[PDB]
Copies of this chain bind each other. A is one copy, B any other.
Amino acid sequence: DLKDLEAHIDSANKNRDEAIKQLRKLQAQMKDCMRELDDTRASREEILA
């Protein structure tokens, strides 16, 4: 049980890394989309107008 919980801790930490890894990639992707959406909405709305 100790080794099972120890291995489970690695799986729990590994599972947390998966969600954290996606958050890191999603954050970089969201920031790029948010930054682009800011310049695009500020430029496209002006260039299209």
- Give the B-binding residues of A (Cβ under 8 A): 1-2, 5-6, 8-9, 12-13, 15-16, 19-20, 22-23, 26-27, 29-30, 33-34, 36-37, 40-41, 43-44, 47-48
Contacts and interface: CB of A to CB of B under 8 A. Distances in A.
Contacts of A30: 26-27, 29-30, 33-34
Nearest to A34: B33
Number of copies of this chain that the complex holds: 2
Contacts of A43: 44, 48
A15 B8 CA distance: 13
Closest 4 CB pairs of A and B: A16-B16, A33-B33, A30-B30, A5-B5
A8 B5 CA distance: 9
